[PDB]
Structure formats: C-alpha cells, structure tokens
Design a binder for this molecule. Structure first.
Ligand SMILES: *[C@@H]1O[C@H](CO)[C@@H](O)[C@H](O)[C@H]1NC(C)=O
Ligand code: NA
Ligand code: NA
Lengths: 11, 250, 28
C-alpha cells in the first residue's frame, strides 16, 4: 500500500 | 511495534526506513549516525536461511519520515547506497550474534527539523545507562501485532532486563553482544518490537548531558509482545570499535 | 557529530516530548 516515489530515485 | 503509540513529529529524527526498490516495500528500520552513514541490523541485509542477500542497488533509504506509506514531499529525503558493510563475524547461522551493519550513502543528506543524527555511546554512557530497569525507546513501522500495520511511526518505551532473566526466557544462546528489554508478566504494562521493526534503534536519553544515544538495534525475538518473552537488541557499544574502523577506513 | 542526539523540535527548543520523562524516572 505504498505511494509511488519519484522516478528520479529509482533510476 | 506492539502496544506503542504514534510518534510525535520530529520525535525520532534519526529514524531511517530501509526500502526495497522492486517491489516497493518496507524492509527494515535503521538509524542516521552522520550525514553519510546509516546503522542497521545485519539480518536486514543478509540472512541466507530466507534467501536474503541484498546488494546496494536493490535498496533505498528514506530519512525524515513519519507516515509509513505516503511519499512525504518536502519533508522526507531518499538516498541511494554507495556501499554496505556487514560485521565480519555476524553469525547468521546460529543466533544473530553481532547483528550489525553500516550503509554509506552516495551523497550526504541535508539535516532539517525532521532529519538529525543520533549519538553512539561511549564506554561511560553505556556503563551508566545499560542497567536492568532503565528504560529505552524503540521506534518503527513494523507490525502492530504478532498475527495490522501502522499509519505512522510507532514508539514504545521498554525497560532493560536482567541478563539471567533474558537467558532463562529462551533456548537460543545469548551473548555479550546482545541485551534484552521488555516488561515482565507481573509488571502489567506491555510492548515490544515486531517484524518490520528490525534494524531500528533502541535509544536512551542521557540524564548527564540530555542527548539521545543509540544503545541497541532491534535484532530478534520469539513472537511479539508474548508474556515471558523479551526482545533482543544488538549491543551497539560492544561493537563500536568495528563501527569506528569502518567509518575511519571508508 | 558535535550536535548528535539533540532534536531540532525538542532539545534544541527546550521542548519535551510526551514520554521522555518516563525514561528519566527509570534512571535511578
Ligand atoms: C551475498 O552475496 C554476495 C554477492 O553480492 C556474495 O559475494 C556473498 O558471498 C553472499 N553471502 C552469503 C553469506 O551468501
Ligand atoms: Na535459556
Ligand atoms: Na514480553
């Protein structure tokens, strides 16, 4: 149930 | 955390969430000890019995958080890991002896009202405060009961327990690198860490200098908040020479 | 860190949290 985090941190 | 309460804003500004990238989920607690170093339990990163062996690129750390699941825009900061260091004598085979690890961040985190490091104890603070009956504080986003999950960070204060009582509560071999905490059945009050709280801090506020020190790391237990059982914590001071060696060398 | 363990919203403002006194009372 986690809110998506900004994509910049997953790059 | 079982039988705890919601944390106040900024109450535990050294709290860190270890977060898996894919799938996106909470892995563990952790703590901030400087602008570039995070302390956690080794079993949060390496536990071969469960096929757990994370690499740096598998993980993120989220610092400054209060809400468990929300992305706390303008408050939390998310950091990538440069390197993991697991204690070389961490005993994952038997009893989680020396359950400690460090994570170096790729870039320093900016401190704020919500992000601030905890102190690590010196010998004298440890000797003075690690006494049966003295209470510390455990924080985490783990389960609210053994067998759900909290909206925000949870906090519980728990007393350190006499070593013979710790030993007599379990069949697992206890070592000097561990201490246990929790209320006894006859004390009435309750509380414990639980699954998901692993790696988070057990802190004490020194009455000498009014600073918070991390004395323990949530390590292991048998169930959560069971009568006659106690939570076990890595004895941070006993492993501090290794912490300092790592930070000094890397 | 020189400033470790002093929380911006508590110790740095001389504000106490709701349960820290429970810890102090245990340090006998
Ligand atoms: C954990 O994984 C690394 C590979 O990144 C490997 O070198 C190491 O031996 C593994 N440890 C164990 C105990 O399996
Ligand atoms: Na025993
Ligand atoms: Na118990």
């Amino acid at each position: 149930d986690f809110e998506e985090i900004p994509e910049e941190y997953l790059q | 955390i079982v039988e705890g309460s919601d944390a106040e804003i900024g109450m535990s500004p050294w709290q860190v969430m270890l977060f898996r990238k894919s799938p996106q989920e909470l892995l563990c607690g952790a703590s901030l000890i400087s602008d570039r170093w995070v302390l956690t339990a080794a079993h949060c990163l390496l536990y071969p019995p469960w096929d757990k062996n994370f690499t740096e690129n598998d993980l993120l750390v989220r610092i400054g958080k209060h809400s468990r699941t929300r992305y706390e825009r303008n408050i939390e900061k998310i950091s990538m890991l440069e390197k993991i260091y697991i204690h070389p004598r961490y005993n994952w085979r038997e009893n989680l002896d020396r359950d400690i690890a460090l994570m170096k961040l790729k870039k320093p985190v900016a401190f704020s009202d919500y992000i601030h490091p905890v102190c690590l104890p010196d010998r004298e603070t440890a000797a003075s405060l690690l006494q049966a009956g003295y209470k510390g504080r455990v924080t985490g986003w783990g389960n609210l009961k053994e067998t759900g999950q909290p909206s925000v960070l949870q906090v519980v204060n728990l007393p350190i327990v006499e070593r013979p009582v710790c030993k007599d509560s379990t069949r697992i071999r206890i070592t000097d690198n561990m201490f246990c905490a929790g209320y006894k059945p006859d004390e009435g009050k309750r509380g414990d860490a639980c699954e998901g709280d692993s790696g988070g801090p057990f802190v004490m506020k020194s009455p000498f200098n009014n600073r918070w020190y991390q004395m323990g790391i949530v390590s292991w237990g048998e169930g959560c908040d069971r009568d006659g059982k106690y939570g076990f914590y890595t004895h941070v001071f006993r492993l501090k020479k290794w912490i300092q060696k790592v930070i000094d060398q890397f | 860190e020189a400033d470790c363990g002093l929380r911006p919203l508590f110790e740095k403002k001389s504000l106490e949290d709701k349960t820290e006194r429970e810890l102090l009372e245990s340090y006998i």
